[PDB]
Structures are given as C-alpha cells and as structure tokens.
Design a protein around this nucleic acid. Structure first.
Ligand SMILES: [K+]
Ligand SMILES: [K+]
Ligand SMILES: [K+]
Ligand SMILES: [K+]
Ligand SMILES: [K+]
Ligand SMILES: [K+]
Ligand SMILES: [K+]
Ligand SMILES: [K+]
Ligand SMILES: [K+]
Ligand SMILES: [K+]
Ligand SMILES: [Mg+2]
Ligand SMILES: [Mg+2]
Length: 1334
RNA sequence: GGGGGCCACUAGGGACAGGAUGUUUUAGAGCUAGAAAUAGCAAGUUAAAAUAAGGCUAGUCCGUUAUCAACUUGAAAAAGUGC
DNA sequence: CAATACCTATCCTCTCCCTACTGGCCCC
DNA sequence: ATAGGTATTG
C-alpha cells in the first residue's frame, strides 16, 4: 500500500490530502469514541486545518515597556517624597496622605478632601492665585520670598513626573536662544567670507519672520523677500533653509561635482559636512556652524514664545501666555456670540455632545474637532478676524496639556527646577543638601545599553552589578558595571564565526577585515596585454603595489584608475584588458581613510606593529556609542595622539559586524607554509587561491582545523527549531501545524511512510509608510506637489495616485506632467513585462499616459526612453521615490535589454521555488522522514520532498477547468493540497531528471522552451508558436511506466474535487492577551464593570467591561433559588475570563462555589475553548464563539458544476477567443444554474443557518435583480455565501441591499447537543452526548 | 542543485532606553428666583492618583508573543490509544 | 429570551542585533 | 478591520 501526501501551507490554513497510485483519495472507517450510539465513521483522507493568525511579539513588548515606564515614573515621585519626608512632616503631617488618596470619594477618604492645604478657604485661594500649575512654577522661579513647602513639592513633582524628552545631548540655553542675534551672526560670517557680495540685513525683523508659526519654506520665502538681490537658492538662502530644517543642495552654490545635500536632522550630516568641507575648504566651516546655531535658536523659539529676559521660566510663561490668550479670546467669543448669534450660545457653551466649547472642555472633542466645529461660526460672524487668524495658526483657545508638548526638552524643565531650588534652598537647608539629588532624579535615564535593573528574574535582562545593593539614580555609576553591561548589550546579539564557532566575528569596519575583503577580491583579477599569451594573475608584489598606490590613496578604486594609475604608470602599458572586476572594485579600505583623516599619520597606519592597537580602537568605536565610555576605553592610547586627534577619534563611531573572526582571517596558519589566510590572499605563487579554495584545499591544514573546531551543541526541539527560523510568526505557526498534520497522517496509514510529500507555500498603518515615503521624497526633491495637491494617507491606497505622487506628478516614459483628475485615462505598465516576471508591486510598475510610449511590449523599455528619462529617474532614485532595482530595469536597454538567458531564468523562476523558508520546511520534513544510511554512509531518501510554486496548480486549474472560488467554502485549501500531490508526483514521474530541481537533497532558447512547455504532457493538443498533438496515454521515456491517462485520470481528479465530505477543522484555541477592553468607563450601576484596583468599587469609580473569555466550562451543579435559597439543579456554560483563569485553575471547586454553584459534579467539568464543535439536529453544527455566543459550524458543499459556472460567469479570472466563446455559450446555456444555486443556498440556510429574516431579504433581493446582467448577478451570488460561510456571522451586500449579520446570542442548546472533539486532521473523533448530563 | 565572502538594493523579525496625550474618581465654595420641576446668568484652560486585577523571587523585577482535540498512565514533563 | 445599534486607546523619539528578495564579482 | 460585549428596547 503506497501513497503520497499533498500539503498547502498558508498563514491561516494547512490543506492536506492523501493520494494513491491512481491519483485517488482513499476513504477509511475511523473508530469513534464517546458515549453516543455511533461507533465509527467514514472519512475521506483530504481536508484543511484552519486557525487564527499567529501574532508578533510587538504589542506585548510595547505594553511591557509602558509598564516599566509607569513603574519608574512612580519611583521618581517616590524618591522626591522620600527626600521631603521629615520637613514636610514638620509642616503638614498628612500632605502626602491627602495626595495618595486624591482619587477616593469623600466617603472613603481618611483625611480632609482638599489635597493641598486641607481646608476650603486656602484651597480656593490657591486656585484663585494660581489657576494653573505653570503660574505657581513661574512664581517660584522668579520670586525671592520664602514659599510654602507643599507648593515647592508640587512644582518640583510636576517637573519630575512630566520631565520632557532627551533627544538633545548636553546642556541647553547656551545663549543660542535669541533668533535675531544668531541671524545677525550668520550675516556677519557670510559678509566676512564674501566682502564683494554683502547682504544688507538692516530693517529685517528676523525674530518675527523665522519664529513665525508657518511652514519652513514659507518662512524662508518671507525672509528672502526682505533681502533684495538675494534668492532662496543662493548661498545665504540655502544656509537659511538648512537652519529652517530643509534639505538644501550646496552643490550649485560652490560649483561642486559631488552632490552636497545637507540636512541637520540626518545622522549623516556630521560626515555630509566634512565631505563637503573636503572641496571648498575649512574657511566655510564657521559659516555652516553659525547656521546650525541659528537652527537651534528657531527650534527653541517654536517652544518658548516669550521673551527670555523677563523671566527665567520662559516655558511656564509661555503656558501662562496660552492661558491668558485663552481667557481673553473666550470672553470675546462669548460676547460676540451673545450679540450676533444668541440662539447658538447654549449649543456652543453647554452641550457636551456637540463639538463646541462645552464638548471641547468637558466632552470628548479634540482641539482639531473643536476648530472644525467653530470655524464656520467665526467666518459667519463679524469681529472674528483675529480669532480666525489664531485658528488657522492652531493657536486659538489652547490648553496647556496638549498633544504637541512632546517638543519640550528636559533641559527646560530642569532649568526651572534648578531655579526653584536656588530660590528656596536659602530657607530650607535640606533643599541645599539635596539640590543635586533632585536634579539627578529629573535628569537620570537608565542607559539603553544597560536594560532592566533586574536581579536574576528577568528573561530580558543582561545587566551585571559591580556590587549587590539597590540601584538608585544617585549610585548608578557605582553599582552598575556600565562597561560590562554595554559590552554584553551587543555581544548577546552578535554571531560567532561559523568556521570557528568559539570566536567572535570582527567589526565590519575592522582594518583587518577590509584588508581581507580587498585582497580576496584582488587575487582573482586577471590581465592581458599584446605580447602576453594568456591572462595572468596578479603577483604578490603587484597586489601590494596596487594596494599601496590605489587603495591607500583613493576611497574607491575604479578599473580606469587600475588601467591608468598602475598599468600605464608602472608597467608602461598603453592598452590592457582586465577581468574579475567591472567598472570599480567592490571592496575598499574605508576605515583606513577615516583614520588617515583623523590622525594624519600614514606611517603609523602602515606599520604592522600598530595592527593590534588599531584593531582595538575600531573595536571600541564599534562596541560603544556612549562618548564617555569610548573616551574611557581610548584613554590607554592618550599618549599616542594629540588632544585634537583624540577628540576627533572619540567623535568617530562605527556600526555593523563582519562574518569572520580575526583568528580565521589572520590567526590560524597552514602547517607547512606557516601562512594565515590573509597571507595566502596577499601572495600564493601563481595559484592565487581565495577564501573558499583556501578553506577547502586538502593539501592545506585550514580545512581540517575548521572541521576540528566545529561543535554542534544541544539540539533544538521541533518547536524551538521552528521558532528560530527567519520568517513571520504566522507562517511559522503554519509550518508547525503542517509537521503535526504529517505525523498524524503517517499514523493513519499504519506507520507507513509516503512515497512523496509535495508542499506549496502561499505568498505573503501601511498608508502611514506610504505618506512618509512620499513626504520624504517630495521634500528631498524640492517639489511643491503636496502644496498644490494635498493628499491623505488612506487615499494612497489607490495604486495610480500613489504612483503619481511617487513620480512627482509626471509621466515616466515622457518628460511631461500628468493630471490627477485624469488618472483613470492613464496606464500602469510593468517595467519588465509580466509575461516574464510576475511582479505586480510598485517596484516593477510605472504610471504613464500610454503604455505604447514604452516602446516594444516584448522587452524592457526601449533605449530612446532611457536616453530621455535617465536623469529624472536618477532624481526619483535619490529621493527614494523609486528603488534602484526599478531604475535598473528601466535602464536595462542601455545594457542590451533582456537577453535569452534572462528570459530562460525568469520562466524557470516561475516554476522552481527558491524562497528559503520553503526550503527549511522541506528540510524539516525530509529529516523527519529519511533517517537511515546505506553502505556508503549516505542518506537513504525513502520519501521525496517536492516543493512547487502556486502558479503550477493555478495554471492546471485554469487549463483543465478545475476552477476555485474562495468565497464558497474552505474546501479549496484541501483541493489545492490534492492537486499539488497529483501534479508533483506526475511531474517527477514523467521527468525524473527534474528531481534535482524539485526534490530536496543533494542553450538559453533550449531551457526557455523546455520550462515553458514543461506542463504540456498533460494536454492532448498544444498550440505553440502551430498545433501539435500528444498521445492519449503519457508514460516515462526510460522506465515505460505510465504517468498520466488523459481518458481516466482527469475523471479521477473531477470525482475527487466533487466529494462533499471534506475534513475542515477549525483549531480550538484558548484565548490569551488583554483582560478586557482598555477603555476606563465612567461609573455605572452595572455588575459588568470590573474594578481597576482591588478597593475601587466600579459603582463609585468606574472601570473596565467586556472581558475576554479564555475558555468556557460546562458546570453541572445546583444554585440557590429565590429568597428561600432552595437548591435547583442547573447545567450551563460559565465563561472563565483571562483574568480569572489562574484563580480557577488553582482550585476549580472553590472558584465555582464562589460564583454561586453548589455540589459541583467535579468529573463532569468540561473545558471548552473557543471554536468548540457541537452537532445538533439534521447535521446542523455550531462552534463556540464565547460562553454566550455561537458561530456557524457547517460547510456548504456546493456541487462542482455550480462552482465552475460561477467562476466562468462572474469572470473570476482568458485564452483563445474561440474557447472564450465556448465558455460564454456554456454560461448562457446553463443560466438556470442561477436559480439552482439560489435553491442550494436556501435549502442549506433553512437546514443549518436558521436566519429567516436574512434569508427572506436575500430571496427578495435576488428576485429583484433577475433582469441584471449575468455578470453582476453571479458576482453578487458570490457575496451571498457570507450568509453560509463557516465561522462568525458577517454583514454582506447583494447589489445595493445590505444584509446585517444574524448572530447566535445564546448557547443554551449546545448543552444538550453532541460535543465533538477532533484530532488535528479531524479523522479521529470523540463525540459526547451532553443530553445525558443533568 | 545546494553553500560561502563581498557590493547594491528590498522586505521582514527580536530586544533595550524615553516622551506626549487620552481616560477614570476627587479637588478647583457656582449665583439668583422659585416648594419642586425649572428658568436666567456666571464659569470652564489646572492638579493629584491609577493606567492591565495583581505576583513573589521583593527586583527601580515580572504580568497581553510562542505552545494547547479527547482519553490512559503520570506530580508534571512525557510517552502511549483507533485498517 | 430576541433583536439592534453602538462600542472597541492614540501618537512619537532613540540605541542595536539578526535573516532574506533580487541583481552583480569571485569561488566551494 | 473583525467580531464579541453591552445597554436599549421590546
Ligand atoms: K471622610
Ligand atoms: K528676494
Ligand atoms: K475634550
Ligand atoms: K488633560
Ligand atoms: K563592481
Ligand atoms: K558603535
Ligand atoms: K596626548
Ligand atoms: K496565544
Ligand atoms: K488572539
Ligand atoms: K482539535
Ligand atoms: Mg502597577
Ligand atoms: Mg494627564
């Protein structure tokens, strides 16, 4: 008994099928367990396992980190209160107690209800004097009087609890504050550099213009308008643009060749400036640095909108400005509405449901919603011009706690905190002794390279302690070994050398590693001249000369430089031909040139004695990113360089890691030669062996030492091995389920292993990324397309509009503008044709007015289009609006277009699966099936694991009319698995030589033709560019075995696809995750509310509702009834929530009795996860959606004729026009299939769905559109299956009629139905008659 | 075919440090005419505290990912059970 | 019970490691 | 975006 398995792996399904020699699917009697009268059941060996998607770890991580941050903010406040304890006790012995119980109702409060002062008079007086906390903050910063200790605490706690960001290193307010002064200093530096072309900046109000609440480019235009004879793209204009945060190109300002694009935000600017300073000199450095200072000024002016010379609290003063303008504008608006629109006053200032001022302050209206609601009211009235100005500036009736306060640096809060401490430490000595402690509470961050400050109970922690004691912000540098912790931070994530598994890999920018790469590439170079008989390798002397003369003098080395600067200058060759490198060398000595610029000592870099030192330096500059730790590590080399060089060296940093270790590159030595790997690369006689040849040569000891150094370690489990794969967690869930399915199927066939296993793997918020890409590309481009055409992110889900914006609103084949409103008239063309590369992504698509303008449609765009559009394409490439691959494909005609080789490769790619994750699945299955070794100690491959791409079975379905319609049911997953088994086995039988291509384990016209016509052996007649005909029976050429009988096997496939009994199994899963919805609802007199804290009664304090049920339990017990508490027997479903799960499982009986149940039949407790299957009458099935709701549990097995009719009639997906005509004729001849399909659906619904209202609405809708075209009627009959689909009910639409979901809001009936426990395949069942309980 | 190093791209996964809102209860004395219902007017911008209930290992740690039909024997892990 | 309509926490900065899609140079 | 919870209305 022989058989094969077909598998279809998806992100929510695993289809599976078993086939015999005749491509038939067996059927077996399977024993049935339980307490029903049924002892067995017939099952076909085909089905599909369905499951909810596997989830990433991201949301869990975000919740975890927010948890940690809440804890640490609480600890900051706790430190501060601990500092204030004794003196506050002297002042007010319950202040902190009133603060801790502020949330409690007065009934539950243990102290007076007024928190600050404890009496109503003083509290009202405080609120009258300081209506906001910022009033008190400003007062305490500015005033000189002794203050109440409680108000000091409140100010400092407000600064510490909400302390602002840390995006700016160092100190702040370094007199970079004033915009006028930095603008005048920029003018002075510019006039110093250009005495002939000076700028008259007199009468220019730089403060108002540059600090104006306007866009960057608008403020730039405003400032340039004040400068006659100066344009926005000149030098001064570009400096102002750089200071405003734009991306000015200083190429044209200085007549440069290398595109000097500078933005102060990018991390590359530090290099992008030095690069630039490499051309025009260092005399312009002062100018750009002054511009950066001005940028700092404007950024601060965005936040501090008040004069910094009237107060040391400009932030608090700016919040007070917000408050005062709010008060004035509110008084004015109230009076205006009273006078002009008196009937709208109540809706505006009293209705919290409306988005007026009432909903803005008391309701749920945002600032944006309130502005939208009130803009027409202001425009409609008179005297609202200034209010409209403030509204369009987004500065009208502003609150102080707002979404845009994330701009505030922590240094500003720190300045105000330090000012208050300076004021009040003259009266409170403990503030003087603890001033720096409080400042440290504010300023201290746990460094990212340290992680959780755990003590051996955090699987996320890696920190090591210098001493075993509690870590505080004041003793961190002493208790925490920041060095060891920062080293572990990187070393716990970096790879070891695979060749030497005990050695750490080198830094990517290690001098040794780059020497290795350069010599490795250089060794395989070959050259010819005239008198030479044969291409020769470069000798060791030649390679050293090339390294010293070219690689150590140019950051990049081109083939032109190799021909002229070496072969001409040294060898006296006027003509030379080179092989092994094209255009320029890929490897380069970048770090050599970095360090040569920094230390300016070439002899130091060339001396082999300093190697170690340099290797350490780079190592440091790669391990660490904190400049203090880098300084502490480089201190051991302080004697070798000047303080200038040491400063530059500590400023330089690297990221990235190589893939080989130092001990492999330049460590282990061949036994006889005594030479390392790099020694062979530098010189190897006339063999010139590279890395692979060196470590694979049996006449050397490298290979044997690699073998010896190898270790294997502990083997992973199946689950561990799958978890460690590189892929999406969803597809890994699919992979694990696939392995389990295979195990069960092997057990079904009596532990006999299959002949073949054919596997196919399906292909695998976002508009936010689209808007980000378009914004960055248009700004980098310098275009105003978002100015003239504003777009929202959702709109970018239209392909043509997204392409339009990615192309700057221009045709890509013609240098012309494109119209937005005409996008329907344009074309979206494939760069490389889809007949070769089935790529439908933006990476291979292009928006053009007419695809005819691409050239010839059989290839890549023509040379003429490339000549026309290459510069504009490069512009789109540099703005990252197109990728470099899209550009390269567009420009392929410059390189000869598509050769025959490329077309052969594309067609082969369409059929041979090369994705790595599918290879890993194949390896897992192959290693589980084939375990024995032959006489030569080589693996015996009893089971051949074939992998296929989806297009094979897709084209099979479309060519032999085995069509699929996904919306009818879930049977198509199983059918895909079956067709995979059939096609794969038949293909490898017909052409065994293809095993290397399709089975796991170890001329261009010819291969193009062959792989194009690989599947023709199924057809009877083939029309290929005339008509040929194949025999009825197809056999193998060598064996003579039969592979395909076209008269009988197609009927077999049809009968298999027609079978109504298909094992669809929805994986039952316990629900995990959040306890409930996250909304903190207000107080309500409902027992659905859940306390947010143990003592916070939700009837007083509000709380959560809508908990998630982890799983239900069947309870058979008794409950007290009525005032007499008489015991009444019950049987019901109890939903154990996620929050209750641990309590219930620790002791189920106590939990159930606390819920009210008595005399619980402990052995009748049945655990029922989500999707538990129940069968009722007439084959009607239900799945558990919760403890109080049910999902549909049956599959509508629509006959095959109706499925294919729906496919063809709906124009689901063509072929010859004669075959199109035959299909159309079949549609029109079987039009009565519409009524027959409605009849099938109606019978199914009346038997199983039981939604009378919805079914009647659907029948009326179908009888309403009987005159509609067959196309639309079929397309909407497709929608109708939402009523019958397995799973949760969902709303659908038949034409314009909407059918809302009929839900099953009660689970009482399943308590007397039959529970069905299914194995993973559903072939093994345990059926429990629940009616026999109770 | 499978595999490695390098260059260029493209898409994904995992971890650390931090900020700003939102919400919830309370505090921010509402006033006047009416028995009340109510009417008229005044006012509004701020703060405290919580932000998964909680846990023991008590850390400035952990608490939403992965994994789960049923039954037997098992403390569990784990095996085993049906053409 | 049954049906119906409404509800559903959001945004942002920053350090770093890893694999893998395709194209290319050289090899095992 | 789903699809399960919830109060409201019978
Ligand atoms: K009280
Ligand atoms: K101008
Ligand atoms: K609001
Ligand atoms: K607020
Ligand atoms: K190259
Ligand atoms: K670094
Ligand atoms: K020195
Ligand atoms: K889970
Ligand atoms: K879930
Ligand atoms: K199951
Ligand atoms: Mg907590
Ligand atoms: Mg708040």
């Amino acid at each position: 008994k022989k058989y094969s398995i077909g598998l279809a792996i998806g992100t929510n399904s695993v289809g599976w099928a078993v086939i015999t020699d005749e491509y038939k699917v067996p059927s077996k009697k399977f024993k049935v367990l339980g307490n029903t009268d049924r002892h067995s059941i017939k099952k076909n060996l085909i089905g599909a396992l369905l499951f909810d998607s596997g989830e990433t770890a991201e949301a869990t991580r975000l919740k975890r980190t927010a948890r940690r941050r809440y804890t640490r903010r609480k600890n900051r406040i706790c430190y501060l209160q601990e500092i204030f304890s004794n003196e506050m006790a002297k002042v007010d012995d319950s202040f902190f107690h009133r603060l801790e119980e502020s949330f409690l109702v007065e009934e539950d409060k243990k102290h007076e209800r007024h928190p600050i002062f404890g009496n109503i008079v003083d509290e009202v007086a405080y609120h009258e004097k300081y209506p906001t906390i910022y009033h008190l903050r400003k007062k305490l910063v500015d005033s000189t009087d002794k203050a109440d200790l409680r108000l000091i605490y409140l100010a400092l706690a407000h600064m510490i609890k909400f302390r602002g960001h840390f995006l700016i290193e160092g100190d702040l307010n370094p007199d970079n504050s004033d915009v006028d002064k930095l603008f005048i200093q920029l003018v002075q530096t510019y006039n110093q550099l250009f005495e002939e072309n000076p700028i008259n900046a007199s009468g220019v109000d730089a403060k108002a213009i540059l600090s104006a609440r306007l866009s960057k480019s608008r403020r730039l235009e405003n400032l340039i308008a004040q400068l006659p004879g100066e344009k926005k793209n000149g030098l001064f204009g570009n400096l102002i643009a750089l200071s405003l945060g734009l991306t000015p190109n200083f190429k044209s300002n200085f007549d440069l060749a290398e595109d000097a694009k500078l933005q102060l935000s990018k991390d590359t600017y530090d290099d992008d400036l030095d690069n630039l300073l490499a051309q025009i000199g260092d005399q312009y450095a002062d100018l750009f640095l002054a511009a950066k200072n001005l940028s700092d000024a404007i950024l601060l002016s965005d936040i501090l909108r008040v004069n910094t010379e009237i107060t040391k609290a400009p932030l608090s003063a700016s919040m007070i400005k917000r408050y005062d303008e709010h008060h004035q504008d509110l008084t004015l608006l109230k009076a205006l509405v009273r006078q002009q629109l008196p009937e709208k006053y109540k809706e505006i200032f009293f209705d919290q449901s409306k988005n007026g001022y009432a909903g803005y302050i008391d309701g749920g209206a945002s600032q944006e919603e309130f502005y939208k609601f009130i803009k027409p009211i202001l425009e409609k009235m008179d005297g609202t011009e200034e209010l409209l100005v403030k509204l369009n500036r987004e500065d009208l009736l502003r609150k102080q706690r707002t979404f845009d306060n994330g701009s505030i640096p922590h240094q500003i809060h720190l300045g105000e905190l330090h000012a208050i401490l300076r004021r009040q430490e003259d009266f409170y000595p403990f503030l003087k002794d603890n001033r720096e402690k409080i400042e440290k509470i504010l300023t201290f961050r746990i460094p990212y390279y340290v992680g959780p400050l755990a003590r051996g109970n955090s699987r996320f922690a890696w920190m090591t302690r210098k001493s075993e004691e509690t870590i505080t912000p004041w003793n961190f540098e002493e208790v925490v070994d920041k060095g060891a912790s920062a080293q572990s931070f990187i070393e716990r994530m970096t790879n070891f050398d695979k060749n030497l598994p005990n050695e750490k890999v080198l830094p990517k920018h290690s001098l040794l590693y780059e020497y290795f790469t350069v010599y490795n590439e250089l060794t395989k170079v070959k050259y010819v001249t005239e008198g030479m008989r044969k291409p020769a390798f470069l000798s060791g002397e030649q390679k050293k000369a090339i390294v010293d003369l070219l690689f150590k003098t140019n950051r990049k080395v081109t083939v032109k430089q190799l021909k002229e600067d070496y072969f001409k200058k040294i060898e006296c060759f006027d003509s030379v031909e080179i092989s092994g490198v094209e255009d320029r060398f890929n490897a380069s000595l970048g770090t050599y040139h970095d360090l040569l610029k920094i230390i300016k000592d070439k002899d130091f870099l060339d001396n082999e004695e300093n190697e170690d030192i340099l290797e350490d330096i780079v190592l440091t500059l790669t391990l660490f990113e904190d400049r203090e730790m880098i300084e502490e590590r480089l201190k051991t080399y302080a004697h070798l360089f000047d303080d200038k060089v040491m400063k530059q060296l500590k400023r330089r940093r690297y990221t990235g890691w190589g893939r080989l270790s130092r001990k492999l590159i330049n460590g282990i030595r061949d036994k006889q030669s005594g030479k390392t790997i790099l020694d062979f690369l530098k010189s190897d006689g006339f063999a010139n062996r590279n890395f692979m040849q060196l470590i694979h040569d049996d006449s050397l000891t490298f290979k044997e030492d690699i073998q010896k150094a190898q270790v294997s370690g502990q083997g992973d489990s199946l689950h561990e091995h799958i978890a460690n794969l590189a892929g999406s967690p969803a597809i890994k869930k699919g992979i694990l389920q696939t392995v389990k399915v295979v195990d069960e199927l092997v057990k079904v066939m009596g532990r006999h292993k299959p002949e073949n296993i054919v596997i196919e793997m399906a292909r695998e918020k976002n508009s936010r990324e689209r808007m980000k890409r378009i914004e960055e590309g248009i700004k980098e481009l310098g275009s105003q397309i978002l100015k003239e055409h504003p777009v929202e992110n959702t709109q970018l889900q239209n392909e043509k509009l997204y392409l339009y914006y990615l192309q700057n609103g221009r045709d890509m084949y013609v240098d012309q503008e494109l119209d937005i409103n005409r996008l329907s008239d344009y074309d979206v063309d494939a760069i490389v044709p889809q007949s070769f590369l089935k790529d439908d992504s933006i990476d291979n698509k292009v928006l053009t007015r007419s695809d005819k303008n691409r050239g010839k449609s059989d290839n890549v765009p023509s040379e003429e289009v490339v000549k026309k559009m290459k510069n504009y394409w490069r512009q789109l490439l540099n703005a990252k609006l197109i990728t470099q691959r899209k550009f390269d494909n567009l420009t392929k005609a410059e390189r000869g277009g598509l050769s025959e080789l490329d077309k052969a490769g594309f067609i082969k790619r369409q059929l041979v699966e090369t994705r790595q994750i599918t290879k890993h699945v194949a390896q897992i299955l192959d290693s589980r099936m084939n375990t024995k070794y032959d006489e030569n100690d080589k693996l015996i491959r009893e089971v051949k694991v074939i992998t296929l791409k989806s297009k094979l079975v897709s084209d099979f379905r479309k060519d032999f009319q085995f069509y699929k319609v996904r919306e009818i049911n879930n049977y198509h997953h199983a059918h895909d698995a079956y067709l995979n088994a059939v096609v794969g086995t038949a293909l490898i039988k017909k052409y065994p030589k293809l095993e290397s291509e399709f089975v796991y384990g170890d001329k261009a016209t010819a291969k193009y033709f062959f792989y194009s016509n690989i599947m023709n052996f199924f057809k009877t007649e083939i029309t290929l560019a005339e008509i040929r005909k194949r025999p009825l029976i197809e056999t193998n050429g060598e064996t003579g075995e039969i592979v395909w009988d076209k008269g009988r096997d197609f009927a077999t496939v049809r009968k298999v696809l027609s079978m109504p009994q298909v094992n669809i199994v929805k994986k039952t899963e316990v629900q995990t995750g959040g306890f409930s919805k996250e909304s903190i609802l207000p107080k309500r007199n409902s027992d659905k509310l859940i306390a947010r804290k143990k003592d916070w009664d939700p009837k007083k304090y509000g709380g959560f509702d809508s908990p998630t049920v982890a799983y239900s339990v069947l309870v058979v017990a008794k409950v007290e009834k009525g005032k007499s508490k008489k015991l009444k027997s019950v049987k019901e479903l109890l939903g154990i929530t996620i929050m209750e799960r641990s309590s219930f499982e620790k002791n189920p009986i106590d939990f159930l009795e606390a819920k009210g149940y008595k005399e619980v039949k402990k052995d009748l407790i049945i655990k029922l996860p989500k999707y538990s299957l129940f069968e009722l009458e007439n084959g009607r099935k239900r799945m558990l959606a919760s403890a109080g709701e049910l999902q549909k549990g049956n599959e509508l097995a629509l006959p095959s004729k109706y499925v294919n009719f729906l496919y063809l009639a709906s124009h689901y997906e063509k072929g010859s026009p004669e075959d199109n005509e035959q299909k159309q004729l079949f549609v029109e001849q079987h039009k009565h299939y519409l009524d027959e399909i409605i009849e099938q659906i109606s019978e199914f619904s009346k038997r199983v769905i039981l939604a009378d209202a919805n079914l009647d609405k659907v029948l009326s809708a179908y009888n309403k559109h009987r005159d509609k075209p067959i196309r639309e009627q079929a397309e909407n009959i497709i929608h109708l299956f939402t009523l019958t689909n397995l799973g949760a009910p969902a709303a659908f639409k038949y034409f314009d009629t909407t059918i809302d979901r009929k839900r099953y809001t009660s689970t009482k009936e399943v308590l007397d139905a039959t529970l069905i426990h299914q194995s993973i395949t559903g072939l093994y069942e345990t059926r429990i008659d629940l009616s026999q309980l109770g």
